[PDB]
Each structure stands twice: as structure tokens, then as C-alpha cells.
Design a protein around this ligand. Structure first.
Ligand SMILES: CC(C)OC(=O)[C@H](C)N[P@](=O)(OC[C@H]1O[C@@H](n2ccc(=O)[nH]c2=O)[C@](C)(F)[C@@H]1O)Oc1ccccc1
Ligand SMILES: CCCCc1oc2ccccc2c1C(=O)c1cc(I)c(OCCN(CC)CC)c(I)c1
Ligand SMILES: *[C@@H]1O[C@H](CO)[C@@H](O[C@@H]2O[C@H](CO)[C@@H](O)[C@H](O)[C@H]2NC(C)=O)[C@H](O)[C@H]1NC(C)=O
Ligand SMILES: [Ca+2]
Lengths: 158, 143, 201, 48, 119, 48, 48, 222
């Protein structure tokens, strides 16, 4: 199984699948034709099934403990689980009319699977993750400044 | 006074955060209107004033440091505001309560150093500010 | 009808929503005839009359002009007290020293929102639901409309929304459907011919 | 008219002091995390 | 009085050599002719405002910052030519495309804002 | 497309011009007055 | 107004951005002597 | 009359440029020379016509090959564009993701009627009385039109345009307060229906216009 996942055809096939996922996601519009909604909701189901099959193949081909450490694939399992949960949640006795539009975002985040082999994006991401503590400190100070001025404005022009 | 360092300085920081939340909940109604929430929040602010005065008098040993200077300036101006409110733009004297969230930076040195660095990175911009002042004055006179 | 109008002149109604309240009261007085008795009162931490009348008046052309002038000269300042305002309204509907219609007794509240339900006041004054309460939520705001809606149908009333100027005219005339409910249940006893006052065609 | 115009310093201070912080926070994050990434490429490319 | 004292004391042959000395001479000459004209003229009034500009070069650092950046701007004149060419091309295209839109008063294409002239 | 393209192009060209002007004289922007500089030599010349 | 915008805003925004850029570099070339870049480089060099 | 004189001027100008390309072609037998022939060709072919008139704006581009400084700065600009293409792709992808999220969130909810009294298309028909400037004594009759917003989130293109306008920090408060009032699929707005939806706009602004735009300038500087 490790021969296929490390091949050159598998990567491009996954690229095609994620391109199709993006195409299905970015086709909704106001007053969309009734024949396109069914296409979208069956493509979502079949592509979710195919992606979870690929994920279970990947998990039981190299190692369970060697993938949890890496953050690149750590949220992929969460995305797959959320996708597989959305289908049963919608089809069961839970309608959640706003819940449809909140579960499409986690399926949309799958586009990031194309930005793995860059060597330039990840190089900056490494430094950002290293300095995330300073980033959070600066953001929190900015938030505190905004809060103080909001309270002063409430006191003055409230 | 007696040694109380690790529990005290985090309890007072939690008190600061709670005061921030209480200040955020308050709704500034127009033309002296009010509801029950502000009626409770006035007593909450009272209790915060007493606890702040108690913890300030506990550690007086203190005034020379600027942060402690602001710390007790807030307390004294709040006390004066309470006195004037009871003995009646007196309501505007509570605008100094907005500086209490600023006390939270003194409780976290990791953020205090960041604030100090940002403030110290402002001195080189004074020349540009002065140039802007001359440009504004000259163009105002020309207009 | 022995109409009485309660106007919220607390602090929160200052601004646009006071202009709508004054216009809504003026348009509502235009739905009253010489056989209907009206009076206007306000309340902001204290309930008081807005004019020189102090009790129900015949609501003829001369008296409505006085009430409209008094309504158009009110200001918003103070806190809201529904318990004090409603007690004043119920007390002027129990006078009986003065000439009234001895008929439909209705209280109309021109407020925006609040949290007080004044359950004790309603039980104390109208336990048997002898007085209808029509409640209006005037202005563009996000205050709690829950208590205002509850006061309406707990006292055989109805709830109206006036968020803009264009909604003033259509909402101040829809209270005659509620008042006409006991008339249709009368049957043939309510099919009596009446003649109006002299008016220009 | 009147002394009501003195409140304009609230929005003058908020704009000047608020915009200075933004140029000292989001620009500092970019500058001190791009030269770090740029220098890594030089070390990584030469070591390759 | 300042001007006459300085021109007497500073050997007027080299007095005009400096840029600052010549700058203030034009200010007073334009200002000195308006004293009898108080009872066109507005242009000469703006001259007397410019005396404050000489006070900008009275500090160590604010003067050199300006000197360095105007010298740098003068050292790169071809970079702004790209902006000028972009503005020219887009203005001409705007003329040819939206130059026939009518000007009204309640719209963003008004008498002050349109594509009907190059300026 | 006209307005969007103009906005993007003008913003990019303005950024490019600003950075080119800043980088043309970068020694002054990182002068480190403590060590030395042309100001010391100019003061020497004027006093001399 | 055109001259006021160009001199007052475009020129000054160039002033501030240049000074800020020349200030970040001063602290970048000072902490580099400590070895802060080495800590990131050492951590990243062992990831491969 | 002015254009007739100017058209006469172009006749002489397009002849000198015509006599110098042939003169240069005599002594020769790059891509910049083809551009010069393209500009002269358009003028001769012009003598539809609107497209040629638009293409007549290529005259200033002929001076690039002459001045060395202009060629150098143009080449430097192209190099700067090439070395910064990584960030543009990332921010374009982020804008695309936010546009998809905005489409899912505000699909068709930006509709409103001409008068703020009717809150569905079945009611927004006919005429209505408008009170000018809020005055009750100055009414005027106006039509009822159920019209969409100028910048909306109907499909992906509209969402991308609206998000671009937001990221330019212009007209974004109006879109914010239009999105806060958004009730439902095909019904009118309510004052401050969902204030918590402003988190989407705040997060988008912080991520793109404050981070991915300052990183652009920082990358150029470094
Ligand atoms: C398009 C107009 C604005 O003309 C420009 O300056 C260029 C065409 N693009 P730009 O996007 O303009 C907006 C930024 O100006 C910053 N500003 C202003 C005054 C101040 O005191 N402090 C401060 O930070 C800001 C408020 F933060 C804004 O983000 O320039 C940038 C330059 C560097 C980093 C990001 C953007
Ligand atoms: C000449 C072709 C490059 C122009 C260009 O393409 C882009 C694609 C994605 C993201 C940015 C760009 C870009 C810019 O140069 C560009 C665009 C914008 I929008 C931009 O910010 C807009 C100005 N500013 C408003 C205050 C944003 C905060 C800046 I700075 C630079
Ligand atoms: C009329 O209303 C008054 C109060 O508004 C009622 O109270 C009486 O008022 C008169 C006037 O002084 C007096 O008889 C007494 O002071 C009050 N009490 C009683 C028991 O009379 C009054 O009952 C109402 N009716 C009449 C006929 O006065
Ligand atoms: Ca109230």
C-alpha cells in the first residue's frame, strides 16, 4: 500500500479530487437550479466516502503514532470526522437549518491540501509558529487598547 | 505586611478582570434612564471600591513607581467620585474607571515588557510628528 | 369607549422614537368621536397628566386640539416605572364623578421596551379583565418586547409595532377589530342603524 | 460653537495612537518573521 | 530693519549666495509693497506665512531627515515616471470609455468628478 | 475591471516607489549615532 | 488640497514607514549576535 | 473643431513614426520593435473603430526602449512582481475561501423594499406614501421596488467583489450593518438582528487587510 501513496499518480488524483470538491463548494448561488442541488448533495456524499476511504488507507499504511505528531495531517482526521458527522446529523431527526452553512466551512478547508509541497509557504509558517507567543502577546495588547477606548467611548458618548 | 505573594497577586488580577466584565455589562442609557442591571452594578462597583482600597492599604510599606502611582490614583479618584455622587458633571468623574483594565498589564511581566518595547519604539517618530505639526499649522494659516 | 393613553416619557425614548410616539398619539386621537372619552397621561418614575384636564373629557374637536398641543410639547427624561404608570391609568378609569361613556374601557401604552411586567398591578386593579390593554412598541430599537407583548393578551388586548413613520397610520386604526369582537357575537341585536354628526362630504 | 468641540481630541488621539500601534504590531510581526524565513532559506539552500 | 542690517553687515556681494538669505528677501519685498495697498493682493499675503519655514532648519535631525529624503527622491526620478505613465494611460482610457456619462447633482459623476477633461 | 485593476496597480506601484526611496538612503535610517557618522566629521570641519 | 495630500500624507507616510523599517533592522541585527536565529535553525535542522 | 486640428497633428506624427520604422528596417535583416510596428499599424488601419481608438493609448509605451532608466525600472518592477507571487496566491486563496463562507452566510439575504414597512416581495408592490425628511405634513407618492443591494453575496463573483471592497477599507461599515440586519433567504431586514455576525467581518479584516497586506510590504522591504 505504501507504493501507491508514495507514487506520482496518487498525488495528482488527490489534487483532482480536491479541485472537484472546491468546484462543488463554489457553485452555490441564490436561485440555483433545482437539478444542481441534488448533484451537489450527492457529490458531497460520494466524495466524503472516497476521502474517508483514502484516509483509512493512509492511517493503516505507514503508522498510527508517526502521524499524530505532525500537525499537517492532524486536523485532516477532524475534517473527515466532521464531514461524516454532517451527513448523519442532517439526515437524522435534527434539521438545524443554520447547521448546513456551518458544516460547509470545515469541508471548504480541504482546499489547503494543495499547499503542502511549497518549501516557501511552510518556511514562513515555521517562523510564525515559533513566534506565536509574541504574536499572541501583541494581539492581546491591541485588544486591551481597543477595549479601553471602547469603554471610554461608552462613558463619553453613551 | 505578612508574606502573601503567590495567591494575593493572582486573586487581585482576577478581581481586575471581573471589574472589566462588570464595566462591560453596564448599558449607558440616554437621558438618565436605567434598568435593574445598573442598579445592581452600582453596588458591585461599591464592593470593588472597598476591596481595592483594602488591598491598597495592605501594601503601602510604593508611590514612587509609576504603575503603583496610577494604581492608587485610580482608587483615590474613584473614592472622590463616590463622595461627590453621594453628596448631590459629577457622573463624568467616573470616566477614570476605564483605566482599571490598564492595571492588568502590571500583573503580567511578559506583556509589560512588550508594552515597554512598543512605547520605547516611539521616540524616533517624534521628529516626524513635529514635522506634521509644522505642516498642519502652515496649511491651516494658508487656508 | 372610555379611552386612556399612557405615554412613556422615560429617558430611553428620547430622539427619533419620541417623535414617532407623539405622531402616533396624534393620529390615534383622530379615530375618536364626540361619543368617546379620552385622556392622555405620561410616566417617568412618576405618573402625571400631560394637560390641564386631570380626568376624562368628551374628546370633541376643541378638547382634542388641547390634548394634541400638550402631547406635542413633552420631553423625555427619567427612569421607567410601569407599576406607577399603570396605577395612575386604572385610577382615572374608576372616577365616576364625571360624565363618561360607561362603555369600552381601554388603556393604550406607547412604550418601546422594558423588563417589568407589573403582574401585581393588573391583579390588584383588573382581576376580572374589565379593561382592555393595547400595547405599542414604537421606534427602531432592540429592547425586550417580551413584557410588552404579555401585558396585551393577558388583558384582552392586542400588540402593535410602529418601527417607522409609514406604519403609524395603519397601526393606530387596527384596534377597532378587537373592540368589534363583542359586537359580532351579539348577532341581530347589534344591527342597529346610527346617524353621524354633520360633516362635509 | 460652545466648548463642545474640545471632545474632538478623543478621536484625534484615538486615530493617531491607534494607528501607531497597528503599524507597530502587524508590521513588526511581518518584518521580524520574514527576515527570519528569508535567512532560513539562505542557510537551507547553501546547506543543500 | 533685519534685512537692511544684515545686507549692510554681511557684504551684500555674497549675501544672496545663501539660499535662506535670498528666501527671506523675497518674503519682505512682497510684504513691504502691501502696506500702502490696504486702502492680486491676496497672493502677496501668503508670502509672510513662509517665514515660519525657516524655523524648520533650526534643529539637528529634523533638517537632515528632510535633506536626506528629498535627495533620495531626486536620485530616483524614473520610478515616479511609472506612476505618471499609469495615470496617463488610465485617464485616457477613462476618457474614451466613460467620457459620455451625464453629470448630475445626486450622483458620483457630478460637476466636480467626471472623465470629461484630462485634469 | 478598470477600477479594480487601477487600484491594484496603483497600490503596488506606490509601495514599490516608497520602498525604493526608503532603501536608497538606508545608512541614515540605521545610522547608530553612538559609534560615528558624517555629522561628527561635519562638526569637526565647522569647528576647524 | 492636492499638494496638502501629497506632502502631508504620502510624504509623511513614507517618513513613518521608513523610520519604522530602519528601527526594526537595528534590533534585528543586534539580537542576531545573541544567537536567536540559531535556536530556530537548530530546531528546524533536526526536523529533516 | 479642436479634434479636427488634433487629427491633423496625428497625421504628421504617424508619418514620422512610419518613416523611421522603414528606415530602421533598411539597415536590419526584438519584441520592442514589434510593439512599435503595432502602434503605427493601428493608426493606419484606423484611417470596429472604438477598439482601435482604445488601443491608440499605447503611444507612451514606445518610449520605454529609448530611455535606459525607464527600461531599468520596468525590469525591476517585473522582477519584484515575480519574487512576490507566492504571497499573492496565498491571499487570493484566502479571499476565495472567505467569499465562499460569505456566500453560504448571506446568500440572497441583502434584499430590501423601497419602504421599510413591507418585508417580502409579495408585499413590495404598487405605490406607497413617502414622508420627506421625516415630516408628517410633507408626503409624496413613490413606487415600491424590491431591489437587491449593490454589493451582495449572491454568488462567488459578487462575494469576491464585496470582500475586495471591504479589504480596501472603503464602504465596509455599510456592508457590515447591512449584513447584521440580514434576516432570511427572501425577506427584509430587522434592526440589529444578529450582531454576532460581525465576527466574520472582523476576522476577515484582521487576517487579510492587516496581516496579509502588511506582510506584503514587509516582504518587499526585506
Ligand atoms: C491607499 C492609501 C491609504 O495610500 C497608501 O498609503 C498606500 C496606497 N497603501 P496602504 O495600504 O494604506 C493604508 C495603511 O496606512 C497605515 N497608517 C497610516 C497612518 C499612521 O499613522 N499609521 C499607519 O499605520 C494603516 C493605518 F495602518 C493602513 O493599513 O499602505 C500601507 C503601508 C504599510 C503597511 C500597510 C499598508
Ligand atoms: C501589479 C500587479 C500586482 C498588484 C497586486 O495584486 C495582488 C493580488 C493579491 C493581493 C494583493 C495584490 C496586489 C497589490 O499590489 C496590492 C493590493 C492591495 I488591495 C493592497 O492593499 C490595498 C490598500 N490598503 C487599503 C488601506 C489595504 C489595507 C496593497 I498595500 C497591495
Ligand atoms: C369623587 O372623587 C373623590 C376623590 O377624587 C372621592 O373622594 C371623596 O371626595 C369628596 C371631596 O372632598 C369627599 O366626599 C371626600 O373627601 C372623599 N371621600 C368620600 C368617602 O366622600 C369621592 O368619593 C367621589 N365621589 C363624590 C360623590 O364625591
Ligand atoms: Ca426606559
Amino acid at each position: 500500500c505504501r507504493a501507491a501513496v508514495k507514487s506520482v499518480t496518487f498525488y495528482w488524483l488527490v489534487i483532482v479530487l480536491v479541485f472537484l470538491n472546491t468546484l462543488t463548494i463554489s457553485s452555490e448561488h441564490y436561485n440555483q437550479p433545482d437539478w444542481l442541488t441534488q448533484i451537489q448533495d450527492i457529490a458531497n456524499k460520494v466524495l466524503l466516502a472516497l476521502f474517508t476511504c483514502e484516509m483509512l488507507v493512509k492511517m493503516y499504511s505507514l503508522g498510527l503514532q508517526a502521524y499524530f505528531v505532525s500537525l499537517f495531517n492532524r486536523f485532516d482526521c477532524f475534517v473527515v470526522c466532521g464531514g461524516i458527522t454532517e451527513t448523519i446529523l442532517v439526515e437524522l431527526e435534527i434539521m438545524s437549518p443554520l447547521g448546513i452553512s456551518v458544516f460547509r466551512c470545515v469541508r471548504l478547508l480541504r482546499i489547503f491540501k494543495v499547499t503542502r509541497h511549497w518549501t516557501s509557504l511552510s518556511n514562513l509558517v515555521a517562523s510564525l509558529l515559533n513566534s506565536m507567543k509574541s504574536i499572541a502577546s501583541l494581539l492581546l495588547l491591541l485588544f486591551l487598547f481597543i477595549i479601553i477606548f471602547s469603554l471610554l467611548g461608552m462613558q463619553l458618548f453613551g | 505586611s505578612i508574606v502573601e505573594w503567590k495567591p494575593f497577586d493572582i486573586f487581585i488580577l482576577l478581581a481586575i478582570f471581573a471589574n472589566c466584565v462588570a464595566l462591560a455589562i453596564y448599558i449607558p442609557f440616554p437621558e438618565d434612564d436605567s434598568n435593574s442591571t445598573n442598579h445592581n452594578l452600582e453596588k458591585v462597583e461599591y464592593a470593588f471600591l472597598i476591596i481595592f482600597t483594602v488591598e491598597t492599604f495592605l501594601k503601602i510599606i510604593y508611590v514612587r513607581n509609576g504603575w503603583n502611582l496610577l494604581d492608587f490614583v485610580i482608587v483615590i479618584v474613584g473614592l472622590f467620585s463616590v463622595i461627590l455622587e453621594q453628596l448631590t458633571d459629577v457622573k463624568a468623574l467616573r470616566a477614570f474607571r476605564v483605566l482599571r483594565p490598564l492595571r492588568l498589564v502590571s500583573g503580567v511581566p511578559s506583556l509589560q515588557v512588550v508594552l515597554n518595547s512598543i512605547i520605547k519604539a516611539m521616540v524616533p517618530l517624534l521628529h516626524i510628528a513635529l514635522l506634521v505639526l509644522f505642516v498642519i499649522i502652515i496649511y491651516a494659516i494658508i487656508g | 369607549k372610555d379611552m386612556l393613553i399612557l405615554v412613556d416619557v422615560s429617558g430611553s425614548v428620547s430622539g427619533l422614537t419620541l417623535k414617532l410616539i407623539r405622531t402616533s398619539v396624534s393620529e390615534m386621537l383622530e379615530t375618536l368621536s364626540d361619543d368617546d372619552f379620552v385622556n392622555v397621561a405620561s410616566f417617568n418614575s412618576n405618573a402625571q397628566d400631560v394637560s390641564c384636564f386631570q380626568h376624562l373629557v368628551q374628546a370633541n374637536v376643541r378638547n382634542k386640539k388641547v390634548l394634541k398641543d400638550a402631547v406635542n410639547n413633552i420631553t423625555a427624561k427619567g427612569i421607567t416605572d410601569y407599576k406607577k404608570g399603570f396605577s395612575f391609568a386604572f385610577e382615572q378609569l374608576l372616577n365616576y364623578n364625571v360624565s363618561r361613556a360607561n362603555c369600552n374601557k381601554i388603556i393604550m401604552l406607547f412604550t418601546d421596551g422594558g423588563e417589568e411586567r407589573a403582574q401585581e398591578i393588573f391583579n390588584k386593579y383588573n382581576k376580572d379583565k374589565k379593561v382592555r390593554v393595547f400595547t405599542f412598541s414604537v421606534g427602531q430599537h432592540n429592547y425586550d418586547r417580551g413584557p410588552i407583548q404579555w401585558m396585551a393578551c393577558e388583558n384582552k388586548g392586542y400588540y402593535y409595532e410602529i418601527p417607522s413613520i409609514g406604519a403609524i397610520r395603519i397601526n393606530t386604526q387596527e384596534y377597532l377589530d378587537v373592540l368589534g369582537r363583542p359586537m359580532v357575537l351579539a348577532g341581530d341585536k347589534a344591527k342597529q342603524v346610527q346617524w353621524t354628526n354633520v360633516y362635509l362630504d | 460653537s460652545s466648548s463642545g468641540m474640545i471632545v474632538c481630541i478623543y478621536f484625534i488621539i484615538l486615530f493617531i495612537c491607534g494607528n501607531y500601534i497597528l503599524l507597530n504590531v502587524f508590521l513588526a510581526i511581518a518584518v521580524d518573521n520574514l527576515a527570519d524565513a528569508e535567512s532560513l532559506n539562505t542557510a537551507q539552500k547553501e546547506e543543500a | 530693519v533685519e534685512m537692511v542690517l544684515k545686507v549692510i553687515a554681511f557684504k551684500p556681494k555674497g549675501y544672496f549666495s545663501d539660499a535662506w538669505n535670498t528666501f527671506d528677501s523675497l518674503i519682505v519685498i512682497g510684504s513691504i509693497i502691501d502696506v500702502a495697498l490696504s486702502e492680486s493682493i491676496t497672493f502677496f499675503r501668503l508670502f509672510r506665512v513662509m517665514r515660519l519655514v525657516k524655523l524648520l532648519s533650526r534643529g539637528e535631525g529634523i533638517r537632515t531627515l528632510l535633506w536626506t529624503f528629498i535627495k533620495s527622491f531626486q536620485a530616483l526620478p524614473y520610478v515616479a515616471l511609472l506612476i505618471a505613465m499609469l495615470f496617463f494611460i488610465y485617464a485616457v482610457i477613462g476618457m474614451q470609455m466613460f467620457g459620455k456619462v451625464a453629470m448630475r447633482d445626486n450622483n458620483q459623476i457630478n460637476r466636480n468628478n467626471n472623465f470629461q477633461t484630462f485634469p | 475591471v478598470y477600477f479594480i485593476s487601477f487600484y491594484m496597480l496603483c497600490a503596488f506601484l506606490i509601495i514599490n516607489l516608497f520602498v525604493a526611496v526608503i532603501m536608497d538612503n538606508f545608512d541614515y535610517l540605521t545610522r547608530d549615532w553612538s559609534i560615528l557618522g558624517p555629522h561628527h566629521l561635519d562638526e569637526f570641519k565647522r569647528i576647524w | 488640497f492636492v499638494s496638502l495630500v501629497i506632502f502631508g500624507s504620502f510624504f509623511v507616510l513614507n517618513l513613518v514607514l521608513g523610520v519604522l523599517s530602519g528601527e526594526f533592522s537595528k534590533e534585528r541585527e543586534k539580537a542576531k549576535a545573541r544567537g536567536d536565529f540559531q535556536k530556530l535553525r537548530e530546531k528546524q535542522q533536526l526536523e529533516e | 473643431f479642436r479634434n479636427t486640428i488634433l487629427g491633423y497633428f496625428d497625421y504628421a506624427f504617424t508619418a514620422i513614426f512610419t518613416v523611421e520604422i522603414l528606415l530602421k528596417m533598411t539597415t536590419f535583416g526584438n519584441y520592442f520593435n514589434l510593439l512599435d510596428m503595432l502602434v503605427v499599424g493601428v493608426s493606419l488601419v484606423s484611417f470596429v473603430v472604438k477598439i482601435l481608438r482604445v488601443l491608440r493609448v499605447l503611444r507612451p509605451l514606445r518610449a520605454i526602449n529609448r530611455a535606459k532608466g525607464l527600461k531599468h525600472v520596468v525590469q525591476c518592477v517585473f522582477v519584484a512582481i515575480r519574487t512576490i507571487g507566492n504571497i499573492m496566491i496565498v491571499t487570493t486563496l484566502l479571499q476565495f475561501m472567505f467569499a465562499c463562507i460569505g456566500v453560504q452566510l448571506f446568500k440572497g439575504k441583502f434584499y430590501r423594499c423601497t419602504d421599510e414597512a413591507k418585508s417580502n416581495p409579495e408585499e413590495c408592490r404598487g405605490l406607497f406614501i413617502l414622508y420627506k425628511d421625516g415630516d408628517v405634513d410633507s408626503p409624496v407618492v413613490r413606487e415600491r421596488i424590491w431591489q437587491n443591494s449593490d454589493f451582495n453575496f449572491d454568488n462567488v463573483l459578487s462575494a469576491m467583489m464585496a470582500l475586495f471592497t471591504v479589504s480596501t477599507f472603503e464602504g465596509w461599515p455599510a456592508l457590515l450593518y447591512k449584513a447584521i440586519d440580514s434576516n432570511g433567504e427572501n425577506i427584509g431586514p430587522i434592526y440589529n438582528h444578529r450582531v454576532e455576525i460581525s465576527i466574520f467581518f472582523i476576522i476577515y479584516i484582521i487576517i487579510v487587510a492587516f496581516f496579509m497586506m502588511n506582510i506584503f510590504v514587509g516582504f518587499v522591504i526585506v
